[PDB]
Amino acid sequence: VFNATRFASVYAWNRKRISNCVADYSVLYNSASFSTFKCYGVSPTKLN
């Protein structure tokens, strides 16, 4: 998602509804593929 080639414009900012699957945010947090990562109200470990 954040590594995708192109994004929608800000005024046009796109919201993709995703549901019914499994995802691991602890690897994405430890992947070091991001410049800035911050959570509000839910820790990245609690997400899994």
Binding site: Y29, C39, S43, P44, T45
Partner: protein, 48 residues
């Protein structure tokens, strides 16, 4: 006691533990001030 204990803007003689990493057992007094860590960011014994 609001007519008594309440002092100006605040009373600092009464303090409480707002956050804790685990649950405190009954009839136990824990004065540990150790910084509470909500997320995965290491606290290193300081706020952040």
């Amino acid at each position: 006691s609001n007519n008594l204990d309440s002092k100006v803007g605040g009373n600092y003689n009464y303090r409480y533990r707002l956050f804790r990493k685990s649950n405190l057992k009954p009839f136990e007094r824990d004065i540990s001030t150790e910084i509470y860590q909500a997320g995965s960011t290491p606290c290193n014994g300081v706020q952040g």
